[PDB]
Design an enzyme around this catalytic site. Structure first.
Site, PDB file in Angstrom:
ATOM      1  N   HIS A   1      48.005 -51.127  26.475  1.00  0.00           N
ATOM      2  CA  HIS A   1      46.773 -51.492  27.150  1.00  0.00           C
ATOM      3  C   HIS A   1      46.338 -50.409  28.153  1.00  0.00           C
ATOM      4  CE1 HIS A   1      48.031 -55.963  26.408  1.00  0.00           C
ATOM      5  NE2 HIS A   1      47.514 -55.388  25.331  1.00  0.00           N
TER       6      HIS A   1
HETATM    7  C1  LIG Z   1      49.537 -50.951  18.513  1.00  0.00           C
HETATM    8  C2  LIG Z   1      48.543 -51.628  19.431  1.00  0.00           C
HETATM    9  C3  LIG Z   1      48.577 -52.993  19.638  1.00  0.00           C
HETATM   10  C4  LIG Z   1      47.638 -53.627  20.481  1.00  0.00           C
HETATM   11  N1  LIG Z   1      47.603 -54.997  20.538  1.00  0.00           N
HETATM   12  C5  LIG Z   1      46.609 -55.551  21.202  1.00  0.00           C
HETATM   13  C6  LIG Z   1      46.453 -56.941  21.120  1.00  0.00           C
HETATM   14  O1  LIG Z   1      47.054 -57.641  20.329  1.00  0.00           O
HETATM   15  N2  LIG Z   1      45.324 -57.432  21.791  1.00  0.00           N
HETATM   16  C7  LIG Z   1      44.493 -56.719  22.645  1.00  0.00           C
HETATM   17  O2  LIG Z   1      43.582 -57.306  23.246  1.00  0.00           O
HETATM   18  N3  LIG Z   1      44.680 -55.372  22.737  1.00  0.00           N
HETATM   19  C8  LIG Z   1      45.661 -54.831  22.022  1.00  0.00           C
HETATM   20  N4  LIG Z   1      45.806 -53.474  22.033  1.00  0.00           N
HETATM   21  C9  LIG Z   1      44.851 -52.680  22.843  1.00  0.00           C
HETATM   22  C10 LIG Z   1      43.442 -52.680  22.338  1.00  0.00           C
HETATM   23  O3  LIG Z   1      43.449 -52.718  20.908  1.00  0.00           O
HETATM   24  C11 LIG Z   1      42.782 -51.450  22.951  1.00  0.00           C
HETATM   25  O4  LIG Z   1      42.904 -51.413  24.372  1.00  0.00           O
HETATM   26  C12 LIG Z   1      41.304 -51.380  22.569  1.00  0.00           C
HETATM   27  O5  LIG Z   1      41.163 -51.461  21.149  1.00  0.00           O
HETATM   28  C13 LIG Z   1      40.677 -50.080  23.040  1.00  0.00           C
HETATM   29  O6  LIG Z   1      39.285 -50.034  22.653  1.00  0.00           O
HETATM   30  P1  LIG Z   1      38.514 -48.680  22.803  1.00  0.00           P
HETATM   31  O7  LIG Z   1      37.171 -48.816  22.182  1.00  0.00           O
HETATM   32  O8  LIG Z   1      38.629 -48.179  24.199  1.00  0.00           O
HETATM   33  O9  LIG Z   1      39.347 -47.582  21.938  1.00  0.00           O
HETATM   34  P2  LIG Z   1      39.914 -47.578  20.415  1.00  0.00           P
HETATM   35  O10 LIG Z   1      39.674 -48.871  19.757  1.00  0.00           O
HETATM   36  O11 LIG Z   1      41.245 -46.895  20.443  1.00  0.00           O
HETATM   37  O12 LIG Z   1      38.781 -46.659  19.752  1.00  0.00           O
HETATM   38  C14 LIG Z   1      38.751 -45.247  19.968  1.00  0.00           C
HETATM   39  C15 LIG Z   1      38.250 -44.609  18.685  1.00  0.00           C
HETATM   40  O13 LIG Z   1      37.812 -43.248  18.909  1.00  0.00           O
HETATM   41  C16 LIG Z   1      38.366 -42.420  17.891  1.00  0.00           C
HETATM   42  N5  LIG Z   1      38.532 -41.072  18.439  1.00  0.00           N
HETATM   43  C17 LIG Z   1      39.298 -40.670  19.507  1.00  0.00           C
HETATM   44  N6  LIG Z   1      39.193 -39.388  19.792  1.00  0.00           N
HETATM   45  C18 LIG Z   1      38.262 -38.928  18.870  1.00  0.00           C
HETATM   46  C19 LIG Z   1      37.711 -37.653  18.630  1.00  0.00           C
HETATM   47  N7  LIG Z   1      38.007 -36.576  19.347  1.00  0.00           N
HETATM   48  N8  LIG Z   1      36.763 -37.545  17.667  1.00  0.00           N
HETATM   49  C20 LIG Z   1      36.460 -38.624  16.948  1.00  0.00           C
HETATM   50  N9  LIG Z   1      36.947 -39.857  17.047  1.00  0.00           N
HETATM   51  C21 LIG Z   1      37.857 -39.951  18.029  1.00  0.00           C
HETATM   52  C22 LIG Z   1      39.680 -43.091  17.523  1.00  0.00           C
HETATM   53  O14 LIG Z   1      40.180 -42.662  16.284  1.00  0.00           O
HETATM   54  C23 LIG Z   1      39.287 -44.572  17.547  1.00  0.00           C
HETATM   55  O15 LIG Z   1      38.831 -45.072  16.290  1.00  0.00           O
HETATM   56  C24 LIG Z   1      46.699 -52.844  21.170  1.00  0.00           C
HETATM   57  C25 LIG Z   1      46.731 -51.460  21.016  1.00  0.00           C
HETATM   58  C26 LIG Z   1      47.564 -50.859  20.092  1.00  0.00           C
HETATM   59  C27 LIG Z   1      47.478 -49.375  19.852  1.00  0.00           C
END
Ligand SMILES: Cc1cc2nc3c(=O)[nH]c(=O)nc-3n(C[C@H](O)[C@H](O)[C@H](O)COP(=O)(O)OP(=O)(O)OC[C@H]3O[C@@H](n4cnc5c(N)ncnc54)[C@H](O)[C@@H]3O)c2cc1C
Length: 518
Positions: A454
């Site tokens: 997280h």
């Molecule tokens: C293994 C795991 C289990 C988890 N379990 C839970 C859970 O059960 N419940 C919960 O609420 N949260 C959970 N979390 C956390 C939650 O999923 C994340 O905090 C949340 O998805 C983050 O959202 P976000 O949009 O910030 O980033 P992300 O969903 O990580 O999206 C970022 C995106 O940007 C892309 N990206 C990054 N850098 C670049 C680049 N330079 N160029 C192009 N694309 C790029 C990535 O590939 C990705 O698709 C979990 C996380 C993980 C990894």
């Protein structure tokens, strides 16, 4: 190729924002994603999520050695596909406590109070369970009770009851500060329902949305104080209106620094030309940390070996049985000090053990530090846009964090000692050593603690004048026009919940800030 909006990262937030912004057919939207389509089976099947670790679906980061963990490095999975981390996570919808927003409103004003955010969060949810749940009933994300919970999970809830943690009638994210519940799931019909499912896919027939996969962004292009586009390996995408970074807590901060946005001296030392002095970039990193209390089971543990012919036949026919489990089937919330008021501990029940000694046939209570005092950061290793950044969470740098986790392990032990659980277990499952004395427990915490996935806060929101703020209350990068960050990076303080909910909420909120309805 030219767009109105270029969104980097098809994750929890970026999927929402691509869908929402493309609702207006007169604006052209690009969604650029490093990973490919979310096509593998293990994405769909709830029980399979952890098998995506170390695959193409996972960025596969690791921290630098952590002094608070005796020098251990901690593995940092991150989703790398359409849906981002919502495609690889453990499907837990556990949206946090209303008081979590007090430090957001302190940083960024009443725009980010609970009253302001609530409708955006409720608006994302479509609850499929019984009435009386706190969740919304109309949003893009199906939220479901478990179809086939493990029999031991009822016993965990009973044990909680015996220890003064009563079952929450609305589920987590309700008014109750303390309590236990079955985990609400990001599932529809026993399969993952990700942000790619709920937001992106319905939008992808739109003529004004281009979803570009297999393209890691190298940096944001800046001209005359404005973000004009993004640079891929082989070409540039231009934005006439705004670039929005939704690349998450790692990628958003790394992209800012690679673009020269950050602390000039540090960027200079990494071989990058400073463009915008913004020292907060990569700072204020926070994360939940957990210690798994693992016991050997005296009963059948279906989740130790879920992928069997019988379970595959039941899953195919009915979408039930072990393969429908997200593994982390129940949660409990409490305070280390036993007080009333918002929780600083979470307990996660998983009826399995990561223990070869017992062949996985054990039961786990993950003890979660919900409000760490420890802080860290992310910096560049150098100017290569393909190189991972240096991730230093500073885990257990604050001694209070160790003491809080120690208290939570005592409570987990209390639960396993309860009438409802003690008959199900017989000693610890190595390498969990079982009960140790007070001093030993502090050392054990440091030896066993690990990320709970997280991470937040590297592009923190805050008002003009707040020197370490990265974005303003409208999520605009301070000192740049036409550039926003909308993902978990902007969160000022890690919540008392699991961060997929927050990221989706930020996506929704960002869309409304960028293009108000009506
Ligand atoms: C293994 C795991 C289990 C988890 N379990 C839970 C859970 O059960 N419940 C919960 O609420 N949260 C959970 N979390 C956390 C939650 O999923 C994340 O905090 C949340 O998805 C983050 O959202 P976000 O949009 O910030 O980033 P992300 O969903 O990580 O999206 C970022 C995106 O940007 C892309 N990206 C990054 N850098 C670049 C680049 N330079 N160029 C192009 N694309 C790029 C990535 O590939 C990705 O698709 C979990 C996380 C993980 C990894």
């Amino acid at each position: 190729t030219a767009f109105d909006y270029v969104i980097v990262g098809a994750g929890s937030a970026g999927c929402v924002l691509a869908a929402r912004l493309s609702e207006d057919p007169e604006v052209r939207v690009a969604l650029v994603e490093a990973g490919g389509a979310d096509t593998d089976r293990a994405v769909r099947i709830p029980a399979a999520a952890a098998h995506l670790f170390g695959t193409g679906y996972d960025w596969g980061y690791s921290t630098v050695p952590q002094a608070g963990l005796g020098g251990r490095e901690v593995y940092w999975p991150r989703g790398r596909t359409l849906g981002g981390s919502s495609s690889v996570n453990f499907l837990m919808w556990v949206p946090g406590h209303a008081e979590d927003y007090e430090p957001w409103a302190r940083a960024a004003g009443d725009l980010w109070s609970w009253d302001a955010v609530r409708p955006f969060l409720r608006g994302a949810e479509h609850w499929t369970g019984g009435p009386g749940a706190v969740y919304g009933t109309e949003g893009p994300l199906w939220i479901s009770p478990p179809r086939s919970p493990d029999p031991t999970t009822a016993r965990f809830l009973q044990a909680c009851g015996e220890a003064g943690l009563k079952e929450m009638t609305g589920g987590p994210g309700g008014p109750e500060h303390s309590g236990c519940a079955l985990t609400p799931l990001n599932e529809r019909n026993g399969a993952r329902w990700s942000a790619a499912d709920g937001y992106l896919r319905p939008a992808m027939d739109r003529g004004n949305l281009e979803v570009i996969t297999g393209e890691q962004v190298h940096r944001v292009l800046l001209e005359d104080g404005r973000a004009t586009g993004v640079e891929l390996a082989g070409r540039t995408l231009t934005a006439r209106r705004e670039v929005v970074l939704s690349a998450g807590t790692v990628g958003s901060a790394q992209l800012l620094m690679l673009s020269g946005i950050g602390d000039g001296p540090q960027l200079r030392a990494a071989g990058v030309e400073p463009r915008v002095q913004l020292p907060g970039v990569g700072r204020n990193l926070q994360d939940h940390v957990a210690v798994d209390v693992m016991m050997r089971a005296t009963v059948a543990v279906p989740l130790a070996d879920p992928d069997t012919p019988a379970n595959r036949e039941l899953y195919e026919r009915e979408r039930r049985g072990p393969l429908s489990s997200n593994i982390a089937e129940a949660v409990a919330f409490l305070r280390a000090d036993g007080g009333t008021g918002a929780p600083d501990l979470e307990l996660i029940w998983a009826p399995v053990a990561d223990s070869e000694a017992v062949g996985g046939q054990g039961l786990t209570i993950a003890v979660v530090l919900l409000q760490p005092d420890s802080r860290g950061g992310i910096t560049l290793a150098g100017a290569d846009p393909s190189a991972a950044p240096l991730i230093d969470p500073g885990y257990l740098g604050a001694e209070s964090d160790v003491r809080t986790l120690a208290a939570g392990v005592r409570f987990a032990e209390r639960l396993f000692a309860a009438e409802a659980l003690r008959g199900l277990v017989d000693g610890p499952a190595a390498p969990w050593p079982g009960p140790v004395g007070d001093d030993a427990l502090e050392r054990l915490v440091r030896e066993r603690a690990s990320t709970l996935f997280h991470p937040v806060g590297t592009c923190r929101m805050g008002r003009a004048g707040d020197e370490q703020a990265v974005v303003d209350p409208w999520l605009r990068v301070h000192g740049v026009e036409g550039l926003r960050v909308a993902d978990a990076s902007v969160i000022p303080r890690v919540p008392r919940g699991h961060t997929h909910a927050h990221a989706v909420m930020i996506g929704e909120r960002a869309a409304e800030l960028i293009r108000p309805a009506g």
